[PDB]
Amino acid sequence: GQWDRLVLNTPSFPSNYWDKFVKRKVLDKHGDIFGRERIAELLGMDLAS
Amino acid sequence: DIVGSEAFQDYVTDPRGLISKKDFQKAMDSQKQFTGPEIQFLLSCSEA
Structure with missing residues (x-):
């Protein structure tokens, strides 16, 4: 559960998974109040700007 | 709710912890789940 911490930053993270909008999705959901x-x-x- | 919140404690410009009024202004409209009417009303209720 910590070893995955060191891959959040890269752009190649959602490689084989299909819906690669993921970063935008979390930014839409949680980024507003953080x-x-x-x-x-x-x-x-x-x-991001 | 906002006691101990990180985005309320972001603007606590007081080492002693007896913080100003406008810390509550800045650190709860910058932070969401509040509303500026409640902000100004609370500082109306607050001891200036």
């Missing part, structure tokens, strides 16, 4: 830049540094997503 640091959207906290998302855009934790989950990669460089220059």
